């Protein structure tokens, strides 16, 4: 009969969105003076 019979009978359509809602910063990286080391002390 009407919906007084369990909640495993109605399968909910799973849609394919995904809210993220988080937030990063910008980056000051490219401005800084890039350099590359190979040991652990210079």
């Amino acid at each position: 009969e009407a919906s007084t019979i369990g909640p495993a009978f109605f399968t909910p359509q799973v849609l394919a969105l995904e809210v993220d809602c988080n937030i990063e910063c910008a980056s000051l990286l490219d401005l800084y003076g890039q350099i590359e080391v190979s040991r652990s002390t210079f």
């Binding site: 009969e1 009978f9 109605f10 399968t11």
Partner: protein, 51 residues
């Protein structure tokens, strides 16, 4: 909704309830509103064993 198809279940559970009920009626159905079954009409010659 309700993946389990309910209508076909009721159409199935009505012919079934009918089938056994007609079988039950023609045996012991009592006169009014049910066919007079041969078990209750009791005009079959009846034999009874001895103790």
């Amino acid at each position: 909704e309700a993946n389990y198809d309910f209508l076909s279940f009721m159409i199935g559970a009505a012919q079934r309830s009918h089938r056994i009920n007609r079988n039950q009626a023609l045996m012991i159905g009592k006169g009014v509103n049910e066919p007079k079954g041969w078990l209750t009409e009791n005009c079959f010659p009846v034999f009874q064993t001895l103790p």
